[PDB]
Design a protein around this ligand. Sequence first.
Ligand code: K2D
Lengths: 99, 99
Amino acid sequence: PQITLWKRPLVTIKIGGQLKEALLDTGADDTVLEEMNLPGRWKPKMIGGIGGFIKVRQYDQILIEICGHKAIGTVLVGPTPVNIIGRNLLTQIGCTLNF
Amino acid sequence: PQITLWKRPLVTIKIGGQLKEALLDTGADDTVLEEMNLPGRWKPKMIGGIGGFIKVRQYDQILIEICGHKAIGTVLVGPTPVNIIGRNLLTQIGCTLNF
Ligand SMILES: CCC(CC)CN(C[C@@H](O)[C@H](Cc1ccccc1)NC(=O)O[C@H]1CO[C@H]2OCC[C@H]21)S(=O)(=O)c1ccc(OC)cc1
């Protein structure tokens, strides 16, 4: 689809068999989701945003479906203010900016 | 143009007579620029993201040229690590997400 930006670009995602709402965030290198239980191993990492750095759990090679488009990649889980889909997954679904 | 997301979507902008590099950021409600001494009146504001909040100065009706596309709206200035073009201006240059 072509998504205009007068509203937040929010979409439904499916991860770990659960549906959630997430923000398509071209300003994020990485995908960061709010606290949740994910299966598999994870390593502690740190990521920085506009307000500083936070501790996150890094899950590698996680299956995640975005508007019916499948992606498999790194998902960070931690105290982000909102679920964000970053470029590591936006590229996998073929997302581009156009103007 | 069409901008892929393999790398950060940085573009050249013109504001207050200065050329800068800024992120085309669908996840940013508003436009946030690195510290700079703009003239005119402002009002204080706080914006939050990963890591918490930062204090910024809100200037209204600021002209920004984004890849030759003119836009005028609210611009926040503060200790951001990156220049961020948000949805308030992205809509004005006809920017959409597409996948
Ligand atoms: C609340 C949604 C989201 C933060 C979750 C909003 N951000 C825009 C993002 O695109 C920032 C924009 C951003 C980019 C780079 C440095 C600081 C901020 N990117 C970001 O935080 O990404 C992180 C996750 O991937 C990593 O790659 C970038 C940093 C990591 S923001 O910078 O904090 C922000 C921008 C405008 C605004 O106006 C109301 C309010 C908040």
